[PDB]
Write an enzyme that holds these catalytic residues in place. Structure first.
Site, short mmCIF file in Angstrom:
data_model
loop_
_atom_site.label_atom_id
_atom_site.label_comp_id
_atom_site.label_asym_id
_atom_site.label_seq_id
_atom_site.Cartn_x
_atom_site.Cartn_y
_atom_site.Cartn_z
N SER A 9 0.55 -10.10 -0.69
CA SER A 9 0.24 -8.67 -0.58
C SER A 9 0.68 -8.01 0.73
O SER A 9 0.98 -6.81 0.75
CB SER A 9 -1.25 -8.46 -0.78
OG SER A 9 -1.98 -9.21 0.16
N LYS B 58 0.79 -1.25 0.00
CA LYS B 58 0.00 0.00 0.00
C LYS B 58 0.82 1.30 0.00
O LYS B 58 0.29 2.36 -0.33
CB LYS B 58 -1.00 0.01 1.17
CG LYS B 58 -2.16 -0.99 0.99
CD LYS B 58 -3.46 -0.53 1.65
CE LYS B 58 -4.67 -1.38 1.22
NZ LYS B 58 -4.46 -2.78 1.61
#
Ligand SMILES: Nc1ccn([C@@H]2O[C@H](COP(=O)(O)O)[C@@H](O)[C@H]2O)c(=O)n1
Ligand SMILES: Nc1ccn([C@@H]2O[C@H](COP(=O)(O)O)[C@@H](O)[C@H]2O)c(=O)n1
Ligand code: NA
Lengths: 326, 326
Positions: free
Chosen positions: A309, A56
């Protein structure tokens, strides 16, 4: 064979320029265990070893870096109980931008502390989604700060897509890329990067059985909310996908499978024992789909990249998962 | 979206295995001059710096290495006045195979000497194509040696295609690959490699105005001979394309342009002065097409690789070309 989308290959290329010598490529080694199990070549993209412990930082850095100086002077505001908060906070530090992050009361202690460490002002407000989000609103009105969406933003999306360019760079003859989905920014970004350069490469999504707004929307043909209950893959606990991310996904994603809580746990245990990496639920979704058997007709005798992720999981939860009769 | 071709992606992958730690990847740097001229990114694949000075070692090594031991015991025979002779000779040395190369009387002195150096027995026979080729025939009948075609052979083709895999390895987001054509083995190999992995990548051929069997066949829709006269691009002086190579080319090649003798010379001068590399006529064909203006709608604001197929040019010819009022 073009697409009239809110994000395009050029946006990703701009993101690559903005991230160069700031945000770095993550390792993507072969997994012998997953390759053996799946009877095909399997590679793990380690976004868990990206700065802040998830991908992110990429989208947040891109969006913040793309601001004009006048815009950077306004200050920024964001809202998250997790990895987005960390990415926005660190990005602020790197760019010398003043940032507030509204986190809900009840947000995990570790994640509050981490986003503090990364320099942004943390505002703990609200025991309720409406109360928390209304603080961000109040902050926008009174302070004039720029809101930084977790996924539903062209610059944020384009920053996540840099991952796709890195994949074709490290593995030109890749066949499949398996990507977890919450709001859809990650997969949207990657799909655009992958499909713009080589559309023969399959991009396939994965969500929890318990909550899968995007899957439901993808199979219904319009945006619908879905959430039966919470999930281990807390990073992808999203009842309703973003508008921009849905348009891209419907257009460019090959499929979306669903995995159970048990499959996610099994995937985390497997990654720890067989590949020596720490994973949060969301980070293990793609690998859970690989072991589920659902992607079997795509992965046998092919090369597939699984996106890890994130690795932002409390050690207490690591202790619990590894302590199970397993 | 498959093709029922005499060569396939698996054949190229086998060739990669056979060449590993024997034949090595060549450099492929950006050319600032050609990029400026073409108003797009241009890269030069230096097969002129491959062993023997052309790419032809690749196809020859693959075909010879693929032979069984019983087949290797038979000995091999080939026929060439040029780079194929060198590739077959060196390949024989590397694999410990006994090889004869029939070269025509009148074959260039430098090239006779070089293929001698590379260890194979050179047989200078024939002032005539029929007389020279009939010696190879006589050698096959009486000695039982295995003939090694310069292009019309699945293993030879598959060895040249390793170049395509190297290109996508070094430049994942390549748009065009520009390839010279004689018999068609080089371009056939590359097309299969490129189109199998990423069919959005354009593969475009280039031949001399003076002689272009393949171009004529490509535009006529069946095999036809064409040769008006000889050419500087002596490596691509071929009146009639191979059968296997034509089938592949018709199927997979995007276009074929033609360049004049002057454009070839200009291309060689440009490569020498602006990129400091030595090129034979055939090796400069792709760059001649880039300067001709004929590929303009493919190359502007794109990334294009030009294949520098060979550098085997007599120094006397280098002296002449550089000595011109240029
Ligand atoms: N105070 C902090 C700061 C970072 N971290 C975590 O440490 C890991 C590595 O962070 P860095 O990349 O910033 O070194 C990340 O998963 C991050 O969430 C933490 O657990 N507590
Ligand atoms: N006797 C020889 C042997 C090789 N050569 C040339 O030297 C160049 C480099 O050869 P090597 O790669 O074998 O070192 C090639 O272009 C080859 O044709 C030559 O001109 N005379
Ligand atoms: Na690469």
């Amino acid at each position: 064979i073009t697409y009239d989308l809110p994000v395009a290959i050029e946006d990703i290329l701009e993101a690559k320029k903005r991230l160069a010598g700031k945000i770095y490529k993550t390792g993507m080694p072969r997994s012998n265990y997953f390759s053996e199990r799946c009877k095909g070549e399997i590679f793990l993209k380690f976004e868990n070893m990206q700065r802040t412990g998830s991908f992110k930082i990429r989208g947040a850095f891109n969006k913040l870096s793309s601001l004009t100086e006048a815009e950077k002077r306004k200050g920024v505001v964001a809202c998250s109980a997790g990895n987005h908060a960390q990415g926005v906070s660190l990005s602020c530090a790197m760019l010398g931008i003043d940032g507030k992050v509204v986190m809900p009361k009840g947000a995990p202690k570790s994640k509050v502390a981490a986003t503090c460490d990364y320099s942004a002002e943390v505002v703990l407000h609200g025991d309720n989604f409406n109360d928390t989000i209304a603080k961000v609103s109040e902050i926008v009105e009174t302070e004039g700060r720029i809101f930084i969406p977790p996924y539903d933003d062209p610059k944020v999306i384009a920053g996540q897509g840099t991952i796709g360019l890195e994949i074709m760079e490290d593995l030109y003859d890749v066949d499949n890329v398996i990507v977890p989905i919450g709001g859809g920014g990650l997969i949207a970004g990657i799909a655009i990067a992958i499909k713009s350069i080589n559309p023969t490469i399959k991009v396939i999504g994965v969500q929890a059985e318990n909550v899968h707004g995007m899957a439901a929307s993808y199979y219904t043909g319009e945006i619908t909310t879905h959430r039966t209950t919470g999930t281990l893959a807390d990073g992808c606990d999203v009842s309703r996908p973003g508008n921009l991310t849905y348009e891209i996904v419907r257009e460019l994603v090959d499929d979306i499978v669903l995995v159970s809580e048990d499959e996610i746990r099994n995937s985390m245990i497997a990654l720890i024992q067989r590949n020596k990496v720490i994973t949060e639920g969301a980070g293990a979704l793609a690998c859970a789909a690989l072991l589920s058997g659902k992607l079997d007709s795509h992965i046998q005798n092919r090369k597939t990249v699984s996106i890890i992720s994130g690795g932002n999981i409390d050690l207490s939860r690591v202790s619990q998962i590894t302590g199970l009769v397993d």
